Design a binder for this molecule. Structure first.
Ligand SMILES: Nc1ncnc2c1ncn2[C@@H]1O[C@H](COP(=O)(O)OP(=O)(O)NP(=O)(O)O)[C@@H](O)[C@H]1O
Ligand SMILES: Nc1ncnc2c1ncn2[C@@H]1O[C@H](COP(=O)(O)OP(=O)(O)NP(=O)(O)O)[C@@H](O)[C@H]1O
Ligand SMILES: Nc1ncnc2c1ncn2[C@@H]1O[C@H](COP(=O)(O)OP(=O)(O)NP(=O)(O)O)[C@@H](O)[C@H]1O
Ligand SMILES: Nc1ncnc2c1ncn2[C@@H]1O[C@H](COP(=O)(O)OP(=O)(O)NP(=O)(O)O)[C@@H](O)[C@H]1O
Ligand SMILES: Nc1ncnc2c1ncn2[C@@H]1O[C@H](COP(=O)(O)OP(=O)(O)NP(=O)(O)O)[C@@H](O)[C@H]1O
Ligand SMILES: Nc1ncnc2c1ncn2[C@@H]1O[C@H](COP(=O)(O)OP(=O)(O)NP(=O)(O)O)[C@@H](O)[C@H]1O
Ligand SMILES: [Mg+2]
Ligand SMILES: [Mg+2]
Ligand SMILES: [Mg+2]
Ligand SMILES: [Mg+2]
Lengths: 290, 277, 292, 292, 292, 294
DNA sequence: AATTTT
């Protein structure tokens, strides 16, 4: 497996150095490139040859950053007063257990049931947490439940997929099973042929139940047992005040950094059987610093 | 982050100087470029490379203008103004709307970035929206009657105006992100990605679009969710066809006069964001 | 402000010279370019860059000639009872004098919200003939694509009149027509140049059937009828024409508008406060004595 | 209108020389170039620019040799009772002389609004064969593509004839069909461009069933029918043809039209004073002695 | 006609030499080129110009080899009783001599209007195997794509034969199908291009049900019955084939056709006077003495 | 068959060497290229010409590798106990003889099994049907998946692929013709996107469905017209015994153990079935299974 | 872009 000779001219070396500079500075989107450095962007976008290099460098940097180290490294790079822990205790759940669950889920280590399902009443802290999580990974994709024919664009290459108000029909019910479970497969692209998506973490929030397939309008639960084998649920019960705002990067970063000095002793025992619904908190709250 | 050493050819510096000239002279469209400097347009439009450079320079100048200062700086007799007389005839107080729009176009008045027009047909509703959109650097137009492909061509524009549409069910949730002003990703029906970061929106429509229609029966539980941050404006009895189209200089003078007025009335109005003024 | 200090290669100066030559000789179409100077057209068409230069130069010349310079002047560069257009107008029992004044005031955008002009009637009534005769007199005119579904209003930007012929208001593009027909500026996609910000142009529509009934996929609705009616001017053609009238040339339009230009601008001013849907019928004591 | 003083490179001179050679050797299609000069085709097809030059040169040669020359001159150049077309026309109970005169006058756009010929009848009767034989003598002919409802009327610009073989008018493209069949200048969109300004082209249509009825989804409408019959002339082909007839040749139609041109024109004018939808049948009284 | 004197550079000469080499070695497809000379193919595929040259050279070589030459010469080049095709035809109750003679006549567009050969029967009877056996002997063969509904007749220009495997005619492509199976020169539509001139090619169709019944929506119509019947010759296959017969190679086709051609033809033109929709059966009293 | 005497340049020679490198190092895909030789990928991806050369070299390497040698050589290639193989245990649990299945899939991957060109796995959910199919599909040099909702283009992905996979296969009425043509396994031509048609010389197909597929759906109803014809070109397996959430995504390296063993033993039990195939795979024989696994 | 796409 010795590398090819290659060598390369000055342009190749300059492009490789630019890719390294982008990767080491945590720049992964065009807007971040514009904010961080404007002179380089303006110089590069002055010609067709320069404009072609922008997309190539961006995707190469994204791939190198994603493949070289796991997402946990990115998510890690007052403890009992953060917004996340307050919300989670309000919704009657142990923050530590779900934190361990998400840390395992991002790295594709939750077995077949590698998904986060959010079922609950509307306007009760559902999409806010999902968006806060999704903004911390280098890049995230959004699944299109509609159009019945291109429902999985911009999924390949991304490090996490997000679903809102999910509606699942039989035409996606079993096709999306591998994506929900993180199995490698091939997904088509517009004006292209297949993309070979290798499996990504998936989080879905829905007001209505999704395990029943909408058979046009009758909504027949033919794939009853099929869908529930892929996702684990985390129900939402109570409401919250309308002045919470954006949960930002710092709070979620600290919340995920919390689970770096404790032990997961309950998780491995809970890992023996994957419950369809996450077990609520009963009498195991009040961590020494809570 | 430390800048990267990217010493380029002379063409790069020429493009940089061209972009600087475009941004300094407030030229943000092809028509203004042709009106001001026809020689440069003719010189550049002689080859594909020149056309590409023109397009890239326009986009970069627009972005530099937008992401440098808030848009109000691009805007900053009293009764003789046409807009004053229109709102007086539209039985609405011009002062409250003037103080509201300035905060609404700054992306800082909380999450209250929503304007919308409906009511009597042929009553000066496209005129005001067009005059407002002619004052921002650039505006983006898209309809809402498709209710399946309605957010195409909205990224990169300071303000988005919808001169048509009807609210359907399939896109109830997605608008709740764009109307709210939160970053999201939407389809474009010919391309793939959008990465829209959220921008102020103005929509004008004629028919009943107020209800969040679910097929035929409106499910009003979702209406309040939009309603916390969907302050509405309504028009009234039709206008004479002599006024025509309102220009942009009068808008400048009107907003400049309204800038120095009291800000306490709107702050007191801010406690209760009623859906009708 | 101060013009930018750009320096261009000799090829760019040659391009500018060609643009100036095109503007001075009033050449705004490819066919006219072939008729006048075929040698240079053949010279340019050797390579792809030549074709690109041809298109760019044509568009630039059209814009340079069209800026300022109200369109009516282009129609006034050059007895009257024997005029074919006048005879056709009398055949339909309409005033040949008021129609000319309305055309003059409408092609310069000095009309108001009534930016359109509808030609309605049974087949073989000269609607298309008159529409094309009016169209060919302006520098350049566009047309609405009948079925493209992605660029329905292409060939509109950079023009002077739009002769939407056989017309039907598709429910897919009903709201774009609601904006184009009104004359207010709007932006549309233009085959690579996404968004165009059209300034607005006068419109003429011909049809054998009513176009205010928008087809709703399969059925026909009436919700949009009032809005379209508010900004349209109708004109009813009823009498069948002779089988061998022939095509109306540019000279007939030139003569008719030249005659209508230098007369009393007062009857239109009387019929300027109220813009009724349809033109009034012919009146005995309202025609010029030269027509009597 | 003094032509531009610009002068091109040597490659442009070679392009002009090739265009002149193509125009003066009566080569208008790729097949003629392939079977006349294979070497030049092979040398040009070695790169993209060569193919572009090929296409542009062919189009320019078409324009040079077609402009300001009536089409019938190309059709015009022994016994007459043994001509295949004459026998076929006599079998269908039509006057060959009148049909020949009508075809000669129709191809020159000198028939007013009757710009379309319609061949109607049961299968295996000779409509397609005769239509193709007529269409094979013009400098170049274009065909309307059947099932592409996004660019339904491509391949029409530049061509001197349009053939609609086995055509049915659909409600999606009926406006464009009405515009094209009329025989008036319009603007139709083309690939890699926008609009082409086709100045009217004669059309021939062959069908087994009625086409005035317009299909739409699963229902047939008759609103457009009365607005179409004025643009068409109908010929009824009934008598079945023998299997050994073979394909007609351009020589047969050339001889037939050359003979038909030199005869009397009074009967055709007498019929043409009032054009009718249906072509008059054979009149045994006229019965030119050369065909008795 | 005097050939053009314009010469080319070394690249054009090399391209022409490559075209001649491709023509002389009977390399008419990419697979054969890769199989024979992989080194040159690898050398060429390293740039866009190389791929363009590959496509152009292949097309030009195919045209040069297949022009002004009967197609049957490619079909034509041991006991005949043991040939697999002969045994299959005997098992199907047909005369191999007559079928081979009809195939030879049909392939060189010399079978009148009967320009379509149809195979009909229950599943697993050898229809597709035989159809593809004679499709690998012609230089290049084309396939009609099943589900496109917008470009149903790509890869048909330049091919010497067309195969329709498991084909059913939908109501939206019946006109184009009729035009193609007619076997007359027409013009078709191509992606990224504007119409190619197809001079008519033989078509062979295999199906399990009846294709003369046109499917429209969810129902079946029989309006287009006689027109489709006039252009086809139908063969009936029954009796299930051996489970391990294999794939019929081109050597079997060549041997069978050479033997069929070497004999007489007097028994063929007896039936060729009146072509029938149904192929005549086998009578034990008329077989060639070799097969008795 | 004298080759053309054309002389290449330095760039062409470099491209040929790169193609040889790709063919030798078994890199017949793009992700493997990024994983193994990332720096060269970055050097090549700095221009349009390099981007074109990447695809050209990949296609040429795939063709050169798969042109002559049968795919069974790629599968076999090249030791723990035989009973330790997870696939063997699963097949035994499903009441099937692993030897017969291994021999059949070795013969089927080379198109040596007559008209039978499709493998069908039928069973209730969670019996381990997708895992085995994907494990087999990960051993071939390159595989394709038919499009799920692309009704206009249901077979775009099958173009120069060693195997095609159809998960949750449901056959509609408007796809039956193309589906039958592809499943037949004969040299055909299929339409791509944005371009003309390409040639497919026949590709083995593996399918996985939770319900019957010989019953074809039409609009909203079901018809059995295309029943015998589809059954004429399929071999069916039943996975009735449900499994436990234990098998962690069976890797490709398992099949090398399973197939190499199966090819080792004598074949004088499969040809007794290969003379006359059946629609359904014969069940388990108690007094015939190889004692090395009992 | 046109095709594909609905
Ligand atoms: N645009 C916004 N800006 C700030 N906070 C918001 C916004 N939209 C919603 N929220 C907050 O999010 C919570 C409920 O909204 P949301 O997150 O959408 O709940 P949901 O169940 O996902 N629907 C409340 O705390 C709101 O204050
Ligand atoms: N093309 C035009 N040129 C000049 N003035 C115009 C034009 N169109 C409209 N106006 C004027 O603008 C005012 C209102 O026009 P308009 O913008 O159409 O209102 P509208 O409510 O959006 N039309 P509608 O959609 O029927 O409700 C009136 O004073 C009109 O005279
Ligand atoms: N190609 C033509 N050449 C010459 N004169 C023509 C031609 N087409 C139409 N005419 C003349 O124009 C008259 C009818 O005008 P026309 O262009 O058909 O307008 P129209 O009434 O709108 N027809 P239609 O669009 O079907 O309703 C005919 O009677 C002819 O005298
Ligand atoms: N491929 C062919 N080769 C030779 N002669 C042909 C061919 N096709 C048709 N013919 C002759 O043309 C006669 C029928 O004319 P045809 O071209 O079918 O016109 P048509 O009546 O329009 N047929 P159709 O279009 O099917 O309704 C046949 O009897 C043949 O003599
Ligand atoms: N892929 C294949 N490999 C080997 N032999 C094959 C193959 N396909 C078919 N055969 C042989 O060909 C025989 C029948 O050929 P076949 O192509 O099925 O005829 P067919 O009836 O036209 N097909 P069908 O359309 O399903 O009826 C089979 O019995 C086999 O002997
Ligand atoms: N992503 C995964 N990670 C770990 N184990 C998995 C995964 N996907 C499937 N499995 C295991 O594979 C076995 C069954 O998977 P599978 O092959 O999908 O059965 P199946 O019946 O084919 N499901 P389906 O294809 O949707 O009908 C179980 O033991 C699962 O635990
Ligand atoms: Mg008309
Ligand atoms: Mg026909
Ligand atoms: Mg078959
Ligand atoms: Mg599965």
């Amino acid at each position: 497996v010795v590398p090819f000779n290659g060598k390369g001219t000055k342009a190749s070396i300059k492009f490789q150095t630019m890719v390294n500079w982008l990767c080491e500075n945590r720049v992964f989107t065009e807007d971040k490139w514009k904010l961080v450095d404007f002179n380089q962007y303006t110089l590069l976008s002055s010609s067709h040859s320069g404009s072609f290099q922008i997309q190539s460098a961006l995707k190469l940097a994204i791939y190198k950053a994603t493949n070289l180290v796991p997402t946990s490294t990115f998510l890690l790079h007052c403890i009992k007063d953060n917004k996340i822990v307050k919300l989670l205790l309000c919704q009657n759940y142990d923050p530590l257990l779900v934190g361990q669950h998400v840390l395992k889920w991002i790295d594709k280590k939750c077995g077949k049931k590698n998904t986060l399902w959010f079922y609950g009443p509307p306007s009760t802290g559902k999409t806010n947490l999902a968006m806060a999580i999704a903004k911390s990974v280098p890049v995230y994709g959004m699944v299109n439940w509609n159009n019945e024919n291109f429902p999985f664009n911009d999924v390949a290459g991304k490090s996490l997929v997000v679903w809102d108000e999910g509606i699942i029909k039989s035409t996606i019910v079993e096709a999306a099973k591998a994506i929900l479970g993180g199995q490698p497969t091939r997904v088509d692209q517009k004006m292209r042929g297949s993309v070979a998506v290798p499996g990504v973490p998936v989080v879905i929030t829905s007001n209505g139940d999704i395990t029943f397939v909408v058979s046009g309008n009758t909504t027949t639960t033919v794939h009853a047992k099929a869908l529930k084998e892929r996702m684990v649920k985390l129900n939402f019960t109570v409401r919250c005040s309308p002045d919470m705002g954006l949960l930002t990067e710092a709070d979620v970063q600290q919340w995920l950094t919390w689970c770096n000095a404790q032990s997961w002793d309950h998780y491995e025992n809970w890992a023996i059987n994957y419950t369809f619904d996450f077990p609520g908190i009963n009498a195991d709250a009040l961590h020494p610093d809570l």
